[PDB]
Amino acid sequence: IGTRLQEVMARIHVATPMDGTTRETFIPEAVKNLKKYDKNDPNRRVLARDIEEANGGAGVFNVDLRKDWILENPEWKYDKIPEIFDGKNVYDYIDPDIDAKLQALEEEEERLEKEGFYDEDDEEEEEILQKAEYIREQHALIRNEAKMR
Amino acid sequence: SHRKYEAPRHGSLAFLPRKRAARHRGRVKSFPKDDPKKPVHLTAAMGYKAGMTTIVRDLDRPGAKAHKKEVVEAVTIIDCPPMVVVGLVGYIETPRG
Amino acid sequence: RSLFEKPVTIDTIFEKDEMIDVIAVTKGHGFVGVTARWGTKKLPRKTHKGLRKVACIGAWHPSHVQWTVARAGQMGYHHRTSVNHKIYRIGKGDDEANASTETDLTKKKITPMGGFVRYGEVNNDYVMIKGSVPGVKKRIMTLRKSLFTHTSRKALEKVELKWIDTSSEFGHGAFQTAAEKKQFMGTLKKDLQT
Amino acid sequence: KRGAPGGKLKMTLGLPVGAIMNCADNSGARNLYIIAVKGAGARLNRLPAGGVGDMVMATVKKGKPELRKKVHPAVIVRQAKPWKRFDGVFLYFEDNAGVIVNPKGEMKGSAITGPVGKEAAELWPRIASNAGVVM
Amino acid sequence: MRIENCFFCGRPAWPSKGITFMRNDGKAFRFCRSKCHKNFKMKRNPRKLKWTKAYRKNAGKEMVVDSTLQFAARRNVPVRYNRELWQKTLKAMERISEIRARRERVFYKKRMA
Amino acid sequence: MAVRAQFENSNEVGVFATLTNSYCLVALGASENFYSVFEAELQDVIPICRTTIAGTRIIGRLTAGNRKGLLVPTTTTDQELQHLRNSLPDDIRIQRIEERLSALGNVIVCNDHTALIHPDLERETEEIIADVLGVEVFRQTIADHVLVGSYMALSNQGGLVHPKTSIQDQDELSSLLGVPLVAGSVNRGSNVIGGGMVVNDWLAVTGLDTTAPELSVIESVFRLGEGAGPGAINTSMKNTIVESFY
Amino acid sequence: AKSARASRIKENHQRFKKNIAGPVEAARLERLSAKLMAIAQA
Amino acid sequence: GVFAKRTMTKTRRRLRDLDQIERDLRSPRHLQQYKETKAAEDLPGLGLYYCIECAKWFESETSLVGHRKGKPHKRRLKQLKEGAYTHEEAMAAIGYRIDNG
Ligand SMILES: [Zn+2]
Ligand SMILES: [Zn+2]
């Protein structure tokens, strides 16, 4: 068998699983109930290209990306979603279980406040520190005199 | 004899002479053409250039590559305290202008 | 006559998303040779009598130097009218968050950290213009309505800002606000010293 | 149709005529020597130059001897000169590299080593189909 | 948009700031400034340069274990948008910032006892 | 149900689209024609999301998924991730992965039951694939190409591979996947199957240059339309295939 | 290429000015004139 | 002494990074890809004498052994013992983490 014939046998060969089994398919039920789209049909489904043509054509029509959002409340579909707050990313802090963690943080905070974690705290020491500062100033003046001389 | 390789001239002759401007404040050479059917409005204002900064814009330009995307652009900030109106000048048309 | 002795704010003359014209005198450069004044090609290295020049200002009749030949002289400080500049924002001076957007909720003003370099602080109403304009800092700028009806979609576009930079322009500023700088920095020695 | 692709935003061109760049494919060539850039205009004394996503005409200096005697179209996929994208990001790669194609943009080789730029991937769908990493 | 962080020094990297190096193994390196970029190109270790967050974390001068640092993360599993969740998240970030500032001041005083 | 289409006069449909049994993702363009092709075929049975990934339009090669999940690369922004999450229903799990080989549509090909991956993908990425997509994962190469998602198109019904795949390789891969496999081409002799077409259990969209014999091969192997089966390839259409591709 | 001074380009721009940009500029002018009239009558 | 020190920081003079060398030491596949990006006939000693830690080719086995006694090799060993700087260390330095569910 030549090379060209071998490639065409490879093209007509149909590989099958050796066990004879088949995988389960997942075709939704509305597919068979769908009516085929026909351009000549007066009752066809209105398409996004038809809407674009009705609203200025390509390069003028501005598509609404939030129209097909599925939210719990449809009144939220056109919100301005916050992203930056005081030098922080809001999306970095988005967490579905945020209330429990915030409550745990507040419980830890009041526990630390009871334990005195934030609690904040001698004239002889002040006098000896002032005298040491005076001595350092005198030493600096002596060194400046030596540098001048 | 002719120049062997063509090249356009350096600079535009439309901006001659390249001398210092006769005044520090810019001069409005032409105002918009007046339509009396429009309501009364002012055609100009003054400000002071303060500097430049950067913005991020959410672009809505259909047909462009950056459509529905964020673009970083340079901008100029002009400090604009309100003007005070203190006068009124009347102009007539003559065969000398 | 009704407007006599009265203050007119910038937003009663211009509006956000409008394209305007900017008139100003450009940055001065003093006396400048032909290479930087006109963009001519440099002559080869160690050309006798100089290389930042034009080799032949005249090779042909008339027995004169023509007005179209590049010559050294004053560069900059020229009157310029530049057109079609989009207004991105008209911020109000009484707004303490006039550099805030809908997606950036930081309450901040337009002035960068440490102030505008060689200008100061913007405490009044301000106009944000896309791009650059002919003036320099401190210079009086004249904003004018466009003389003709626009023909571009860019004049029709509405601007949606997400963020305005307010970091220092006196260096590589990485902080939009002083609170952000302190939060990243942490406690300093002088903080306990105070 | 000539080799210059449409819808390409302005970028810093890092590779003029005379540059030798790596070959990022497995066609057999090791390097590509740029002799012309598709879509280059006319200006006195100006070297034609291309950036990432541009089609150039190249000769092979190192590689299989069968590729040495021809001028191949190639697409620059990586450059080391920093350039800016529309999101404000200035960026660069650690080498200059391209892949040999035909005038229709289809690749001569079958695999790409290393990443490719977003510009090259978006302008050439076969390169996008043969890229493992897009940066 | 979002605030990145510098690979070398850890500072906030806002848009159009710094430069990104694309390495041929497929790794991107974002730098906030040319200082960090040039130190990287000179192959200086950030862990040894004392002005970087890498050095400070290695030396133990940054608050590392703390409950307030567990709230910010790179979320690779997205959450459906909810207005109330976003508003209470904003309130949470404000409260967390205040608590973190207080605990950081306590940490610094413990260092300088 | 195989439909010819173009995205801005390009025949590489799988470059610009990702089609599963539960959703469709299409690149955002300057017009609505490419979206309208998918909308005319799928009339709101599954959602179609206009998507951008990493600021690029090559979303079919940047993304990978099936009816259970969607995997997006690490350079996907938070806003693109949020748009995808808001567009798809909660039955579909979306995850952004930190895989070094970020062209997920090139390095992963999957039906609802199994996934073939690039052999150099990380073990963490393999575990995330097996979790989010809910499939068995195997490291394979098609015709010595490591980019399995760009050199193979896969459904639950069957699969179409690189035309230079050996018969023993087809048999081994068909036993591994559990579906019938055929070596064939799209787009007038192109071997980039995944870049050339998208497919699910009841629809295929190929490029406009796909010839009538290879369109018949695609319909047979993916069981699209009434009376479509892979046995027609070596029984009814054998003369047509031998005449066309000799 | 058709020049910026071409008759067809001028006619295209005149149609654009009359039908598209004109109403937008007119509505903006109405708003601005109302604000400045309020200042003038205050 | 560094050859042509003026242009040492150019991208066309770049050398292999320490984290890449760490991955080369941990995984032979990574090293194999890096060596595949080169040509064996153009390498010193036909590529037979290679120091992974310094990412360097040598003309002979005696040259490689003699290089191991020098301080540049010992500096590379000390740097590898200290550990290369990575994106994980960069994230941990600011206390940022990755949430994968
Ligand atoms: Zn830095
Ligand atoms: Zn060594």
UniProtKB/TrEMBL annotation, chain B:
Binding site for Mg(2+) 1: 1-2
Chain sites annotated for binding Mg(2+) 2: 2
Family in the record: Belongs to the universal ribosomal protein uL3 family.
Name of the protein in question: Large ribosomal subunit protein uL3
UniProt source species: Chaetomium thermophilum (strain DSM 1495 / CBS 144.50 / IMI 039719) (Thermochaetoides thermophila)
Full protein segment contained here: 2 to 98 of 392
TrEMBL record, chain C:
Binding site for Mg(2+) 3: 169
Family: Belongs to the universal ribosomal protein uL3 family.
Name of protein: Large ribosomal subunit protein uL3
Organism phylogeny: Eukaryota, Fungi, Dikarya, Ascomycota, Pezizomycotina
UniProtKB/TrEMBL annotation, chain E:
Any one GO biological process: assembly of large subunit precursor of preribosome
Gene Ontology cellular-component annotations: nucleolus
Any one GO molecular function term: structural constituent of ribosome
Residues that hold Zn(2+) 3 according to the record: 36
Binding, Zn(2+) 2: 32, 36
Domain annotation TRASH: ranges: 6-44
Cystine bridges: 6-9, 9-32
Keywords tagged on the record: Metal-binding, Ribosome biogenesis, Zinc
Positions with a binding annotation for Zn(2+) 1: 6, 9, 32, 36
Family: Belongs to the eukaryotic ribosomal protein eL24 family.
Protein name per the record: Ribosome biogenesis protein RLP24
Full protein segment contained here: 1 to 113 of 225
TrEMBL record, chain F:
Keyword NADP in record: no
A Pfam cross-reference name: eIF-6
Phosphoserine modifications at: 174-175
Compartments reported by the entry: Cytoplasm; Nucleus, Nucleolus
Any single biological process term in GO: ribosomal subunit export from nucleus
GO molecular function, one term: translation initiation factor activity
InterPro entries in the record: eIF6 (IPR002769)
Keyword flag Nucleus: yes
Keyword entries, A-Z: Cytoplasm, Initiation factor, Nucleus, Phosphoprotein, Protein biosynthesis, Ribosome biogenesis
Domain of life (superkingdom): Eukaryota
GO CC term, one of those recorded: nucleolus
CDD domains: IF6
Record PTM text: Phosphorylation at Ser-174 and Ser-175 promotes nuclear export.
Main location: cytoplasm
Function: Binds to the 60S ribosomal subunit and prevents its association with the 40S ribosomal subunit to form the 80S initiation complex in the cytoplasm. Is also involved in ribosome biogenesis. Associates with pre-60S subunits in the nucleus and is involved in its nuclear export.
Family: Belongs to the eIF-6 family.
Assembly behavior: Monomer. Associates with the 60S ribosomal subunit.
Name of this chain's protein: Eukaryotic translation initiation factor 6
